[PDB]
Amino acid sequence: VHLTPEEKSAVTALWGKVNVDEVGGEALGRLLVVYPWTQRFFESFGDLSTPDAVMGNPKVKAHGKKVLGAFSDGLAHLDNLKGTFATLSELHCDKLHVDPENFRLLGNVLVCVLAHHFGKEFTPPVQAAYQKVVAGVANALAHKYH
Amino acid sequence: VHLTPEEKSAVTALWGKVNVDEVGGEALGRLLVVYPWTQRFFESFGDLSTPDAVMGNPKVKAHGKKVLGAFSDGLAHLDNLKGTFATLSELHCDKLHVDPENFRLLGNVLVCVLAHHFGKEFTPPVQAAYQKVVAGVANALAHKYH
Amino acid sequence: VLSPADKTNVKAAWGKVGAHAGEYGAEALERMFLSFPTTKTYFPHFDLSHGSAQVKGHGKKVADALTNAVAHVDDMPNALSALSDLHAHKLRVDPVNFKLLSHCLLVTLAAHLPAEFTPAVHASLDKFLASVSTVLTSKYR
Amino acid sequence: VLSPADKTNVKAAWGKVGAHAGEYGAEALERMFLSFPTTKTYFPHFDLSHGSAQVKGHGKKVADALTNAVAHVDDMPNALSALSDLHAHKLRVDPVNFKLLSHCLLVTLAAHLPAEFTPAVHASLDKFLASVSTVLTSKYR
Numbered sequence A, B: 001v002h003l004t005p006e007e008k009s010a011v012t013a014l015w016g017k018v019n020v021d022e023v024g025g026e027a028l029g030r031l032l033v034v035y036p037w038t039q040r041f042f043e044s045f046g047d048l049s050t051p052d053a054v055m056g057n058p059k060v061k062a063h064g065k066k067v068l069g070a071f072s073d074g075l076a077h078l079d080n081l082k083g084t085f086a087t088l089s090e091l092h093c094d095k096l097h098v099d100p101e102n103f104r105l106l107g108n109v110l111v112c113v114l115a116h117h118f119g120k121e122f123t124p125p126v127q128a129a130y131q132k133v134v135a136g137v138a139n140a141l142a143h144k145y146h
Numbered sequence C, D: 001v002l003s004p005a006d007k008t009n010v011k012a013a014w015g016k017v018g019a020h021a022g023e024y025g026a027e028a029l030e031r032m033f034l035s036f037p038t039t040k041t042y043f044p045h046f047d048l049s050h051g052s053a054q055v056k057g058h059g060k061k062v063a064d065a066l067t068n069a070v071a072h073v074d075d076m077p078n079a080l081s082a083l084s085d086l087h088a089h090k091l092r093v094d095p096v097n098f099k100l101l102s103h104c105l106l107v108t109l110a111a112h113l114p115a116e117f118t119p120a121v122h123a124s125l126d127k128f129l130a131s132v133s134t135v136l137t138s139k140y141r
């Protein structure tokens, strides 16, 4: 949460211009191509033997859509991340058993995804804003491990 | 991330046999040898240029004494590792700048040291236990981040 | 990685392992499964209760493997080819676990070889299994 | 080194980099100092602030270093030795800073080369840095 307002205003700002319909599938899809092992959690989804394969899929995109929401949700609540992701922290840890290290990887893929969509507009300071954020979320998403 | 009786008793018991003047040195000395880079927060310890030089460094051997004292006392307060390590968290974080990853590393090194001294007595159930302590402790020690 | 000296050290450590690698490898598994349980799923069809059958056999599996890799130090990506495909595509093993088993494997050597497990061997040994782990999880598709 | 498909793309990623490579490298560095302040205590002698030329030439150094590391791919430990020896030994650099710089590099490449930032090059590029990262890490002591 510990973000200067300047960063806080910068975030929502950029955040607004985001295609909430595409970005998440972009992120989660990329997560699988870049970090394959992570596929071991989405066998329920289908063809993921090739990139275009993984990328095309509507579940992967359908899902990232849910994931992003959880992010928007997080952004709208920086002073309460731990609380905001509680059941998720359980779902991912207790039930699913996702290694918390993949929370950080997704967090950084999201950052690459944004960067890809806003080009030069995703400036070094803005990125800095987001890193404090994606770290804030991966970190509270793994709390039921703490 | 919680400790049962069977465990609590097992962890206390074995620690009872831990020579608080030799484990730290070993644990800290191994960190410096196994994970070289950790050597950067200890350049004012003079020489640590070879395994031996490090292992026989009254500075090295010294510091691990207080590092393990740190553990030994935090092992008394298993229910509030967050309090017990509060002041050390700020230090290594805001002051020292030790990446929280090296905390998971120092603990597994320690566990490696307990196995090297108690051989067969450091049985799996024994390790399962000590693992949770080093886990909470590394976690506890990375608190002033997150 | 693992400089020449490391090559030298790894073999020193191996030497004293000999045919022991069956209990040792099995004890690492045994231990890993207990200390970090999530890791249990990669084996949902396995009986891994202390002393168990499948555990011991699989123990030889992992062992023979490391001797192949050690005797094959410079030829690691290829000499270990069969495995990569299995652990990456079929198994899709989260790399963190190769960190978990590697640690346990280490706990075991140090518990059965107090004179071999020195700070120099240690570093050389961890680097070994790190280098084996990398080549075990790099192939993913 | 790794998948010819991986060298295919990595070759083609720096194929549109060209003369910008110097500048892209410095953005990564700049990105790395702003998002991960701690990395700044490795350069306590530079004007780590905006526009510093120090970062500039420096980024060029890293970029070329990389281009150079793209060339001698199948033998990076070799062609990057003087470096293995410089960051691992001379400066003792925690590998978490390598993962950080590599990440800042993908973001820079992503911000400037959208059409070339395909998931496939993203994976290919990220592995290449995992490796370059290791070489400047597979020699500490």
Ligand code: HEM
Pocket: A038, A039, A041, A042, A044, A066, A067, A070, A071, A088, A091, A092, A096, A098, A102, A103, A104, A106, A107, A137, A138, A141
């Ligand atoms: C920290 C970033 C992450 C966030 C915010 C997040 C969020 C979510 C959310 C909101 C759900 C909805 C579940 C539901 O109620 O249907 C979900 C499901 C799920 N997530 Fe994540 N997640 C993250 C990282 C990961 C990672 C790294 C993995 C592993 C690759 C993962 C694997 C899964 C799986 C397997 C499901 C259930 C899919 C199903 O319904 O079958 N998540 N996640």
Ligand code: HEM
Pocket: C039, C042, C043, C061, C062, C065, C066, C083, C086, C091, C093, C097, C098, C099, C101, C102, C129, C132, C133, C136
């Ligand atoms: C030191 C690193 C490791 C080595 C050298 C190694 C080696 C091997 C070998 C040789 C086999 C059997 C190949 C065959 O004959 O079919 C195998 C199987 C297997 N390994 Fe590993 N392994 C390592 C780490 C891991 C880790 C970290 C996991 C996951 C926690 C794992 C999970 C498995 C599983 C699930 C099988 C298949 C068992 C079966 O159904 O037959 N391995 N491994």
Ligand code: HNI
Pocket: B038, B039, B041, B042, B066, B067, B068, B070, B071, B088, B091, B092, B095, B096, B098, B102, B103, B104, B106, B107, B137, B138, B141
């Ligand atoms: C390699 C990095 C590193 C790691 C992983 C690490 C891990 C740990 C762990 C286990 C997670 C514990 C319990 C621990 C405890 C301590 N450390 Ni650590 N320390 C590290 C680097 C240091 C350094 C450097 C100091 C000197 C601090 C100072 O300013 O005096 C230090 C000092 C201490 C002190 C003494 C502080 C004082 O005199 O005021 C304690 C106690 N520690 N350190």
Ligand code: HNI
Pocket: D039, D042, D043, D045, D061, D062, D065, D066, D083, D086, D087, D091, D093, D097, D098, D101, D129, D132, D133, D136
């Ligand atoms: C933050 C830690 C850090 C990281 C992660 C890192 C990662 C990398 C990577 C990743 C793939 C590459 C290719 C690389 C390449 C280089 N670095 Ni790095 N370097 C780092 C800290 C430094 C420092 C510090 C210097 C010298 C600074 C000085 O005092 O001039 C340096 C100098 C260099 C030089 C110049 C050498 C010379 O003087 O001839 C090259 C080339 N590098 N560095």
